[PDB]
Design a protein around this nucleic acid. Structure first.
Ligand SMILES: [K+]
Ligand SMILES: [K+]
Ligand SMILES: [K+]
Ligand SMILES: [K+]
Ligand SMILES: [K+]
Ligand SMILES: [Mg+2]
Ligand SMILES: [Mg+2]
Ligand SMILES: [Mg+2]
Ligand SMILES: [Mg+2]
Ligand SMILES: [Mg+2]
Ligand SMILES: [Mg+2]
Ligand SMILES: [Mg+2]
Length: 88
RNA sequence: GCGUUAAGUUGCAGGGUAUAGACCCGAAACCCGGUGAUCUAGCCAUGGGCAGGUUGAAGGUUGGGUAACACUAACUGGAGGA
């Protein structure tokens, strides 16, 4: 759902440089962007169960990445959820 | 068979009959034209009344909760031919 420009913008804002697409912060920010963007799709299409399975995978993938970041560097974790607006 | 050989008629009094309320009193009812919604039934307009004490619906806020909902606890709130 995310376009190329929007994706590239996130990589630059959370990565080390322009092609640090793999860092945990970038991945979590990318997932957060798609999850938030898809809230408008599922408000209109409540019965799109097949797409929602893909969304719930993003949610669980983000939870696992966050639990890993919190276990490695708590400081990086705290900054990340604050910038993104996540409860935990 | 009915008649012919038996005086009627007009007053007055009386007996009966007829039409009339027709010896007197008495229905329940039927019809016609009026008077009544100051009681009461319903409605319409415009005003008033309901001591005191209870119960605690929806909603709201805050926290928990969720990807977001849902959900949940407290506080608040003051529903009802209660
Ligand atoms: K005579
Ligand atoms: K008589
Ligand atoms: K009362
Ligand atoms: K309540
Ligand atoms: K009450
Ligand atoms: Mg993907
Ligand atoms: Mg006479
Ligand atoms: Mg008659
Ligand atoms: Mg009759
Ligand atoms: Mg009258
Ligand atoms: Mg009256
Ligand atoms: Mg009552």
């Amino acid at each position: 759902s995310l376009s190329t420009e929007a994706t590239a913008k996130i990589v630059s804002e959370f990565g080390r440089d322009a092609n640090d697409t793999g860092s945990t912060e970038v991945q979590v920010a990318l997932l957060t962007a798609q999850i938030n963007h898809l809230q408008g799709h599922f408000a209109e299409h409540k019965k799109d169960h097949h797409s929602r399975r893909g969304l719930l995978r993003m949610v669980s993938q983000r939870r696992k990445l966050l639990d890993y970041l919190k276990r490695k560097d708590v400081a990086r974790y705290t900054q990340l959820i604050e910038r993104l607006g996540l409860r935990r």
